[PDB]
Structure formats: C-alpha cells, structure tokens
Amino acid sequence: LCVLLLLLEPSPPSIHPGKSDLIVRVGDEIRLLCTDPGFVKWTFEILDETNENKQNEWITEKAEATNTGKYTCTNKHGLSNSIYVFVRDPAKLFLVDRSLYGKEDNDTLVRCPLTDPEVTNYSLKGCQGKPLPKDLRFIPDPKAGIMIKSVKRAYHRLCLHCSVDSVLSEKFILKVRPAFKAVPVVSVSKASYLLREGEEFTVTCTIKDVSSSVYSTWKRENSQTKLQEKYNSWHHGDFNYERQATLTISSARVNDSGVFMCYANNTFGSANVTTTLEVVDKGFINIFPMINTTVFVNDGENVDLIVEYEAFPKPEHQQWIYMNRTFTDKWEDYPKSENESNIRYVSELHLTRLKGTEGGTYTFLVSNSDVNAAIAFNVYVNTKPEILTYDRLVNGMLQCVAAGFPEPTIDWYFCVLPVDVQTLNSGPPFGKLVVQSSIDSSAFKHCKAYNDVGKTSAYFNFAF
Ligand SMILES: *[C@@H]1O[C@H](CO)[C@@H](O)[C@H](O)[C@H]1NC(C)=O
Ligand SMILES: *[C@@H]1O[C@H](CO)[C@@H](O)[C@H](O)[C@H]1NC(C)=O
Ligand SMILES: *[C@@H]1O[C@H](CO)[C@@H](O)[C@H](O)[C@H]1NC(C)=O
Ligand SMILES: *[C@@H]1O[C@H](CO)[C@@H](O)[C@H](O)[C@H]1NC(C)=O
Ligand SMILES: *[C@@H]1O[C@H](CO)[C@@H](O)[C@H](O)[C@H]1NC(C)=O
Asked: CA angle, corner 422, sides to 419 and 427, nearest 5?
C-alpha cells in the first residue's frame, strides 16, 4: 500500500514500491525505499558487478542501462528482500559478459540478461548466418541469461547469439573444457635398460590426454630423489594434449638400478607404465648346460649337446672344440628371444652316428669384449674294449692292458681261471677307462677283456 501521509516473529525488511521487477525509462530516476528499523545496506548486482549503499533510500538520478539488476535490502537481524530493476533503452537490450566458458556435461550460462522484459519469445539462436545443432537444450532467463543445458564437447569454439522477439545481440565464442572419460594413456620410450657403470641413463615418459590438467610423475621406486625430470608438452588441437618428461642420469652407477614408474592420473582414473634398469660394472657371461655335462651314448646313436647362456655385451666369438680342434660342421646357434632385452642365447652341438671312436671331451667356448667363458661336456661312448698292450715283465708274470667302455674287466684262463695281480690305471685316452691285470704263470703243464658291451682277447704262450 502507499505509505501513510505523515505531514510536516522478527520480520524481513519492507520495500517500496511493492513490486517484483520495475521497468524504468533510461535517463529517469530510480527511487527505491527500504523500511526496517534495523536496516543495514542495499546491495546492487548486475553481472559480476557489486555495489553497496548504506542509505535506506536508493536514488540514482539519471538511470543508465548498466543500472539494471538486483537490489537487495538487508537488516541487522540477518534478514532481507529484493526487487529487480530493468532500465529499458531502445539502444541496449543487452548487457553482457562475453567471457563464455562451460565444462562438458555441466550446464553453462550465456550472460546476456536483457534490460527490457516486455518481449515475447526468449529463445536461443544462430551465429554468423548458420542456426543451431539439434539435441541442444536451453532454458532462458531474462534476469540471468540463457543457460545452454548439458554442454557437449562438440560445442567447442561454437559461436551464437541471444534470441528474443527480433533482437540484435553481441558476439560470443563458446569454449568447452572437457571431462575426463578415460584413464590417461601413458607410454615409455623403452621398457628396459641393461647398463654399464659410466654411461648416460635416459628415458622419456610420454603422456597423452584430453587436458593440460593431467597429473604425471616419475617415481624412482624406493624413493629418495624425485631427481628432476625435464618436462615439455604439446597441444595437438583442442582436446589433445601430450607431455613428455624425460628422466636422465648423466653418470650411471650400479647403485642407481631399480624400477622407474611413470604414473598418470586424472579425475577419471589413473595409469602407470614401468621401466626397469640394471647397471653392471663388468661385461659378463654365465653358462647353462641343458643336460648332464656327463653323457653316455650307445655305439651307433646320436646326441645333442645343448647349452643356453646369458651374455652382456653381445657375443663376438664362440665355438665347439673336440681334440684341440674346433668345428665348422655340425652345430647350431641362436638367440632365445628376439626382444630388445635379450641377453640370453643357446647353442647346440649335434653329434651324429658317432662310432665308438668319437668318445672324448667336448668344450663350448664363448666371449664378449669383457669376458670369455666356457664349459666342458664329457662324452663317453660305448665301445668294444681295445687291448692297448700285452706285456711280459718277468717273474714270469704276464701282463695285459685294455681300454673301452664301460670300464673293461680282465678275466684269465689257462687250459677254470688264474687270479689277478693288478688294478687301476691313471690323462689320455679321454672317454675311455683303462684296465691293468696280471698273472704269475709259475705253475705249469701244457687274457680276456670285457664289460657290459664287448669282449676282446690277446694271447701269450710259453713252455715249461
Ligand atoms: C556437472 O554437475 C553434475 C551435478 O549437477 C555432476 O554430477 C556432473 O558430473 C558434472 N559434470 C562433469 C562431467 O563434471
Ligand atoms: C588422482 O586423482 C584422484 C582424483 O582427484 C585424487 O583423489 C588422487 O589424490 C590422485 N592421486 C594422485 C597419485 O595424484
Ligand atoms: C599400476 O597399474 C597396475 C596395473 O594396472 C595396477 O595393478 C596397480 O594398482 C597400479 N599401481 C598404482 C600405485 O597405481
Ligand atoms: C646326471 O646328473 C645328475 C645331476 O644333475 C647327477 O646326480 C648324476 O650323477 C648324473 N648321472 C649319472 C648316472 O651319473
Ligand atoms: C621380450 O622381453 C623378455 C626377454 O626376452 C621376454 O620375457 C618377454 O616375453 C618379451 N616381451 C615382448 C616384448 O614380447
């Protein structure tokens, strides 16, 4: 009601005039009145603008367009009330904040509140000719602006105008920040390093993601340094970003070695890729026979001497030798895996149809720039005992000496059996054990070797 003409529960503050919004001609005075015995201030607020006035009556003599907005009366008891003031200007139907930014999946408010609400259709429209995309929603408000609903990444760098019944707006360029909808994609330049005390350790973690906000870090795993990374980053467009953080150690020392992990994280989720590094101070090699180093073969059969082994640096010399003489003729060689981390090899020596003669000791040799290493396979072959030598050192004692495999046992016969006078025999031959037995012959009246394989004989004769 109009206020008495005075000639001359705790309540919220009263305002005059008692209206919600008030249209006011440009250049005309804005006269607002607040009645509250415990009044404090009137706050005015268009867009980000803010202003205070500690006088119960707000008076602006020559209203401008900018003067359009929310007028809130507030009392000491914490309580308030507001009224909105539209200052219609035939010229300016929009005061604006061109700065438009939205976040994918959240709403956005275009800031073009109008200074005149006596208009018929508050809608959203085109840009430089063209109209709008479909699926796009907007719930407009004369007091706030127009709120584009549930922005899509697709709307990036879009341009648009404020619609109402038609009105000329000003130029806006939409900018959509993206939502993380996928863990970061992280990679390393090389998953593994075999190093030599003294050289330079280097690596580049590569992280690709949709926003400069991705969190990435290197992690010397048992944690001492955070020893600086050398960052650098690119932006391949709008939602494509990649950053490289190269890790380096000028002088690689044994102690260094461990797993360096590249961690990446974003509000969606996290991802890590690991690279292990081992630094050695001596070129090395160690072998691995794949069968007993001792081997037995039957007369006509075959064998494969196999052996794997670990070498770093890569080998540059390797052979098989039988009698102080190497091969060219019956052996294989090959990397175990053809990765980049392969330090491991394998060689086979294919002995075939080997006659009882091929018995002996076989050696495999291999070396790199720093070390040489080798191991020996003792190959015993089964063969018929050969009578090395028949002797007659005389107490009349007759001797007989043979070799073969397995060890050859010597039985004697007169013409029953004699006894023995001997025993073992330590060198070459290799892969053949030698037997030595003797008899006395001092008993009158007118030499057999054998083992699990064969039996040979030599013969003596004498007379009483
Ligand atoms: C936007 O806000 C809603 C809640 O209103 C939230 O759940 C949604 O995730 C937000 N959008 C994004 C992708 O941050
Ligand atoms: C990864 O991001 C999530 C989401 O904000 C956060 O809770 C967490 O602290 C982050 N962890 C790391 C390793 O930065
Ligand atoms: C690293 O990733 C592996 C493989 O997905 C996962 O099992 C582990 O939880 C991750 N570690 C950290 C600390 O994020
Ligand atoms: C075969 O090698 C094993 C050890 O790996 C050993 O115990 C054995 O003596 C060898 N074979 C024979 C019959 O000697
Ligand atoms: C190669 O790296 C190691 C060494 O050979 C092996 O264990 C692994 O299976 C291989 N991985 C790749 C790159 O396929």
From this structure: 150
